[PDB]
Assembly symmetry: C4
């Protein structure tokens, strides 16, 4: 992606690949290698995403927020 260090990828139920990056983005990648979307946080995403049973993607950022992102890439909430 963009981050020298990547976090560890998570695999969604539909096979989307999620990885966080040093460049502040959480990347969602289709199984063919094409970017599905990328979500901007305010800091480096070193931690590995977790995926809930409805498909929500949870990941921490160094901007101090735990993010909850909908599978379509839109913010659901952030926890402070």
């Amino acid at each position: 992606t963009g981050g020298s260090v990547h976090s560890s990828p998570a695999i969604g139920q539909d096979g989307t690949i999620y990885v966080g990056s040093n460049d502040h983005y959480l990347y969602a990648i289709n199984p063919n290698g094409k970017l599905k979307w990328k979500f901007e946080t305010g800091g480096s995403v070193h931690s590995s995403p977790a995926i809930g049973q409805d498909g929500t993607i949870y990941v921490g950022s160094n901007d101090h927020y735990l993010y909850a992102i909908n599978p379509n890439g839109k913010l659901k909430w952030k926890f402070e």
Copy 2:
């Protein structure tokens, strides 16, 4: 949460989201983004929690303890 670095979140069977933090807390977050509880350890919680089959949350802290926390947020035991 509070930690610049978050650990990687774990997802409980009822959907609670658990993440450790630099601020010494393990956070339990409801799926709507509201704090369910937070558990105080004596040091920074860099490691990612694991969840047992009865729902117990295990996480290490830099106070040198492996903690076992009940789903209600109460200490079950700590290992030294």
Copy 3:
């Protein structure tokens, strides 16, 4: 345990809790908090263990070996 930093714990199928430690040991802990056994590697165990379908515990150490440990705590093999 002994390590200031713990790795992230893994949970075996029988509920044993495995965590690696800065003190060079991989710890196996019973669900009641009592040490089941500890396995000595030649260096700090920062990575998180993985558990195979027969229950073998795989974990890397900074002595440069990937260890495969039987559930009874005895070495199965190490990879160099």
Copy 4:
């Protein structure tokens, strides 16, 4: 393996053990401890691999690529 630090291992559905290494390789190890194959990236592989439902192995490298590797050890794609 070769890396002082190993990433955390992943276990494939057929029981192959995958671990990334400081030496730039992702190692695939048979359950008997014998090297199945190793895949060369352009940098240190600190993150832990994830395994898709068809068995593809995804892992990030410090050469800035998220790699997708077929179970036979051949590159499927890399994401930039």
